[PDB]
Design an enzyme around this catalytic site. Structure first.
Site, PDB file in Angstrom:
ATOM      1  N   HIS A   1      -6.013 -15.334   0.239  1.00 39.41           N
ATOM      2  CA  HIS A   1      -4.620 -15.211   0.675  1.00 39.41           C
ATOM      3  C   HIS A   1      -4.521 -14.288   1.887  1.00 39.41           C
ATOM      4  O   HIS A   1      -3.821 -14.595   2.842  1.00 39.41           O
ATOM      5  CB  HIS A   1      -3.734 -14.773  -0.493  1.00 39.41           C
ATOM      6  CG  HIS A   1      -3.451 -15.877  -1.439  1.00 39.41           C
ATOM      7  ND1 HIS A   1      -2.163 -16.319  -1.736  1.00 39.41           N
ATOM      8  CD2 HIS A   1      -4.296 -16.636  -2.148  1.00 39.41           C
ATOM      9  CE1 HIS A   1      -2.240 -17.324  -2.600  1.00 39.41           C
ATOM     10  NE2 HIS A   1      -3.546 -17.546  -2.869  1.00 39.41           N
TER      11      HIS A   1
ATOM     12  N   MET B   1      -1.641 -13.754   4.985  1.00 37.61           N
ATOM     13  CA  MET B   1      -0.544 -13.349   4.113  1.00 37.61           C
ATOM     14  C   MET B   1      -0.490 -11.832   3.971  1.00 37.61           C
ATOM     15  O   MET B   1      -0.855 -11.291   2.927  1.00 37.61           O
ATOM     16  CB  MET B   1      -0.621 -14.041   2.746  1.00 37.61           C
ATOM     17  CG  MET B   1       0.750 -14.111   2.106  1.00 37.61           C
ATOM     18  SD  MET B   1       0.853 -15.396   0.847  1.00 37.61           S
ATOM     19  CE  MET B   1       2.494 -15.036   0.241  1.00 37.61           C
TER      20      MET B   1
ATOM     21  N   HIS C   1       0.822  -1.196   0.000  1.00 40.07           N
ATOM     22  CA  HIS C   1       0.000   0.000   0.000  1.00 40.07           C
ATOM     23  C   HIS C   1       0.864   1.256   0.000  1.00 40.07           C
ATOM     24  O   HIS C   1       0.354   2.321  -0.243  1.00 40.07           O
ATOM     25  CB  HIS C   1      -0.959   0.001   1.204  1.00 40.07           C
ATOM     26  CG  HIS C   1      -2.095  -0.958   1.131  1.00 40.07           C
ATOM     27  ND1 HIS C   1      -3.111  -0.918   2.066  1.00 40.07           N
ATOM     28  CD2 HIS C   1      -2.412  -1.934   0.256  1.00 40.07           C
ATOM     29  CE1 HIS C   1      -3.979  -1.861   1.782  1.00 40.07           C
ATOM     30  NE2 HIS C   1      -3.598  -2.476   0.676  1.00 40.07           N
TER      31      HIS C   1
ATOM     32  N   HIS D   1       0.317  -6.886   1.488  1.00 37.66           N
ATOM     33  CA  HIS D   1      -0.364  -8.164   1.503  1.00 37.66           C
ATOM     34  C   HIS D   1      -0.257  -8.835   0.156  1.00 37.66           C
ATOM     35  O   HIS D   1      -0.125  -8.176  -0.850  1.00 37.66           O
ATOM     36  CB  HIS D   1      -1.824  -7.990   1.932  1.00 37.66           C
ATOM     37  CG  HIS D   1      -2.642  -7.164   1.008  1.00 37.66           C
ATOM     38  ND1 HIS D   1      -3.281  -7.662  -0.113  1.00 37.66           N
ATOM     39  CD2 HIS D   1      -2.956  -5.849   1.046  1.00 37.66           C
ATOM     40  CE1 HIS D   1      -3.938  -6.675  -0.742  1.00 37.66           C
ATOM     41  NE2 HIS D   1      -3.778  -5.555  -0.024  1.00 37.66           N
ATOM     42  N   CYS D   2      -0.410 -10.150   0.192  1.00 37.51           N
ATOM     43  CA  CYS D   2      -0.536 -10.911  -1.046  1.00 37.51           C
ATOM     44  C   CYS D   2      -1.916 -10.611  -1.642  1.00 37.51           C
ATOM     45  O   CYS D   2      -2.855 -10.338  -0.888  1.00 37.51           O
ATOM     46  CB  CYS D   2      -0.368 -12.375  -0.669  1.00 37.51           C
ATOM     47  SG  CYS D   2      -0.647 -13.529  -2.021  1.00 37.51           S
TER      48      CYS D   2
ATOM     49  N   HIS E   1     -11.311  -3.252  20.864  1.00 38.36           N
ATOM     50  CA  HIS E   1     -12.358  -2.967  21.835  1.00 38.36           C
ATOM     51  C   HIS E   1     -13.753  -3.244  21.296  1.00 38.36           C
ATOM     52  O   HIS E   1     -14.733  -2.707  21.876  1.00 38.36           O
ATOM     53  CB  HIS E   1     -12.218  -1.555  22.404  1.00 38.36           C
ATOM     54  CG  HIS E   1     -12.693  -1.387  23.801  1.00 38.36           C
ATOM     55  ND1 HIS E   1     -14.011  -1.517  24.149  1.00 38.36           N
ATOM     56  CD2 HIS E   1     -12.006  -1.109  24.930  1.00 38.36           C
ATOM     57  CE1 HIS E   1     -14.109  -1.263  25.445  1.00 38.36           C
ATOM     58  NE2 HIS E   1     -12.913  -1.055  25.956  1.00 38.36           N
TER      59      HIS E   1
ATOM     60  N   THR F   1      -9.595   4.947  22.377  1.00 41.86           N
ATOM     61  CA  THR F   1      -9.767   3.936  21.364  1.00 41.86           C
ATOM     62  C   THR F   1      -9.763   4.645  20.022  1.00 41.86           C
ATOM     63  O   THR F   1     -10.138   5.824  19.942  1.00 41.86           O
ATOM     64  CB  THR F   1     -11.090   3.205  21.603  1.00 41.86           C
ATOM     65  OG1 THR F   1     -11.137   2.735  22.959  1.00 41.86           O
ATOM     66  CG2 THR F   1     -11.330   2.060  20.669  1.00 41.86           C
TER      67      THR F   1
END
Ligand SMILES: O=N[O-]
Ligand SMILES: O=N[O-]
Ligand SMILES: O=N[O-]
Ligand SMILES: [Cu+2]
Ligand SMILES: [Cu+2]
Ligand SMILES: [Cu+2]
Ligand SMILES: [Cu+2]
Ligand SMILES: [Cu+2]
Ligand SMILES: [Cu+2]
Lengths: 333, 333, 333
Positions: free
Chosen positions: B138, B143, B93, B128-129, B299, B273
């Site tokens: 995936h 992954m 990304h 990520h894959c 949470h 949070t």
């Protein structure tokens, strides 16, 4: 030496109302004393008459809104009467250390405890029960509320100018997970221990059966609608201790919103809808400009209109036809 | 001419640890060389012994945290050994073009590839894959990981003053969708192709069976709890490649949070949070003020305590009774 | 006196295209006249041929993007032809009073109405049908769109400098809840009244069967992919009237994002992914830097690749090997 500080005792009120306070601190730091009594009680949460075993602070879902100023001390006397059956405690997201206080406040039925913490960060914050090994069960039984830690000089807009509200309301939004049988009907239980596994199974679906404001479908409607006048500045504090919500004032806006509730940050302006993450309190400031009925919802509109996450304002005053008007009322082609 | 730039080889470490780096860049732009080896492997992900066929970068869920500076070049050698059965690739990304690199990194078992991209934007980012036609399978097999692109002058607060962490951890949060039979028990499969339709069916419920940190229920507890000392400044990078999460340090805060992970933005202060959207990495900076055990959770407390999204810090040092104290320990009325 | 103001009639276009407008207002405040005709129609929403009874504004899911400037007046003529069967209305999140207009726009088949409101707040906003007692059913049948209220001096970055887009697209993301039988197949219905209870049951699962852009799986692909050139500045307005989404440009970023859509706020920079809450429109500005195919998704990748929330850009121009390159193409060890 905390013993040299003023003590002030607060007398809490039932949500969505909020106990008397000053926006701008009229004294130096204080030890602000609160007492809450845990009440396990049956609650009817929908129009069908579905009855759950709720776990409350002070008899209400949500628990009451506590209000202090930054760098006050919160001293809470937490009472678990021997009429209750379960162990409870309290975690303040506003506090620092010992799991927010939960590690220091474990009370069996027939016990009480007094916790003190320094409110070092301004904002609205969730508080909730959290007994080790049974945390979501207590929270999603209603055992949560919020605390507002105001900056000592009150609220400020994104330019550093004062924002002063005329009225404040506290909307606690509760996801319940009433166990269902295979056919889809709610089950009921003889004891909390017999209920526990089915409560856990129902929670693990991650699909609430009910999502309600102030503890029940329609609780903030009719004779319990929220009210305001045109021109009034209103702060709506909204909490969700376990699941995301997306509040929206139907017919209005959040003029200034702290979506994740912490007042050292500049507010987001002109929000239609804002995301309060599960485990968070947020606050929205709005100046009413039109009279009439408003709905205040979680804008997952299924959650609002089918599962219960909808309340009403009734707003009094003059209608502004510059801002909105029916040019041609519905009529036939 | 990229060939004129320094090359530095990074040797990765297993999450939640992070490879050695400098917050403030001690050199000019560099080609930073990483190697990761794809490993398909069985993993036990819960206390019941549920075993899945995980798809990993470098043997771990999440994949390791890669750290560079803005305007460095990331050069990744991605190896898919012939001991694996599936095609994989990698989408960063942090990168620009070719689906984040996924279109250029398709490796069959027995192949490798080397991708280079310029890290033009500072922040934490998911990698990520993402093989065309099988992307969520995936990702939700584990992954995915993250890459941190630090500003060359390190991190800054909302006023432009330096924030320097003493320790960093990487919490990768993984939603798994283990197929269930009608009675609710997990199914197991002979081959990935026989598993695929049931994997797709289980994903389409949108209800994770498990949500875990560092690849398994309880992975960041006990002898693998995160640690800190009172007064230490800690950055927790948290990623979720597929689903929203709402991190919370029980007993603490996010003093400064980039909830959606991009350091050109001022951090949000004093968060209880924060919402990290699925497909995002976020980062929270906190200075510990109290010793003891903390829990670090998603949470949605069902997701935390029932489905696995909970880890622990063990914090060493002195207790501050000004900040919190038990005034009256639990005792009987 | 609104009668003294210029009137300009807009002729709407079908999403994802957007009607002609000026970013910087070239006139003073205007009454901007829109007409939309409600169309109930059958729509095929997936590759399997699943056919639903959609409820549309102007024949499309989403409804068209309306564009005005801050402090213009929006005057909408809303027509419900007698070929429709249901009552509809319209709520503008951009408007103030009467439930956003919904209380003033109730039209039975064979009726029309004209609503005027002042667009006092700049931003992108959802509009949707919302008939009392059947709100989520209309919304989740497709009956929603968006309106962009531009600041009169156009868009600005976080430092107050102009951001000018070369192209704008409107991505409406729709969660559908097609009722299923026990075996999991979609049911079909003779009349909307016979469909209603099963529609309500399906909504109450909170699990969409489909999540689509521009009304159908694959609608923004192939000959209907979005397009751009390298170097072009593109604004993507994205709405979700009922459920959270997390948009992501695969291979790109949101250089400047108003995740909750309101332009008086500084945009978030360099986003990988951003959360648009259900009931919100958001907007992301990106300057393309690489040619090729991009996917634009909801980065719950199950929602993207299994349930439909994925579209494509086709981008024309030169490839920049400094920004990304395959150093060693996939090949065998
Ligand atoms: O504008 N609320 O549906
Ligand atoms: O404060 N965490 O439950
Ligand atoms: O980067 N999108 O999967
Ligand atoms: Cu309790
Ligand atoms: Cu909590
Ligand atoms: Cu893979
Ligand atoms: Cu991605
Ligand atoms: Cu309608
Ligand atoms: Cu609405």
């Amino acid at each position: 030496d905390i013993s040299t500080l003023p003590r002030v005792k607060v007398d809490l009120v039932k949500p969505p109302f909020v106990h008397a306070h000053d926006q701008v601190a009229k004294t130096g730091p204080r030890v602000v004393e609160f007492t809450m009594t845990i009440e396990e009680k049956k609650l009817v949460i929908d129009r069908e008459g579905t009855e759950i075993h709720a776990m409350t602070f002070n008899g209400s879902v949500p628990g009451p809104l506590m209000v202090v100023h930054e760098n006050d001390y919160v001293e809470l006397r937490l009472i678990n009467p021997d009429t209750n059956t379960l162990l409870h405690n309290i975690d303040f997201h506003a506090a620092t250390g010992a799991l927010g206080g939960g590690a220091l406040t474990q009370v069996n039925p027939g016990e009480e405890t007094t916790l003190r913490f320094k409110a070092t960060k301004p904002g609205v914050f969730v508080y909730h029960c959290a007994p080790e090994g049974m945390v979501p069960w207590h929270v999603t039984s209603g055992m949560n509320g919020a605390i507002m830690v105001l900056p000592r000089d009150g609220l400020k807009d994104e330019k550093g100018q004062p924002l002063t509200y005329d009225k404040i309301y506290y909307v606690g939004e509760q996801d319940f997970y009433v166990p269902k049988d295979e056919a889809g009907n709610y089950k009921k239980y003889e004891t909390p221990g017999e209920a526990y596994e089915d409560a856990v199974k129902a929670m693990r679906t991650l699909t609430p059966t009910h999502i309600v404001f102030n503890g029940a479908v329609g609780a903030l409607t009719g004779d319990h609608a929220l009210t305001a006048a045109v021109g009034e500045r209103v702060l709506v504090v909204h909490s969700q201790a376990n699941r995301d919500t997306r509040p929206h004032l139907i017919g209005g806006h959040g003029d200034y919103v702290w979506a994740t509730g912490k007042f050292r940050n500049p507010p987001d302006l002109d929000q239609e809808t804002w995301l309060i993450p599960g485990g968070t309190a947020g606050a929205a400031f709005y100046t009413f400009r039109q009279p009439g009925v408003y709905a205040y919802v979680n804008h997952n509109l299924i959650e609002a209109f089918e599962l219960g996450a909808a309340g009403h304002f009734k707003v009094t005053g003059e209608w502004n036809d510059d801002l909105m008007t029916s040019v041609v009322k519905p009529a036939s082609m």
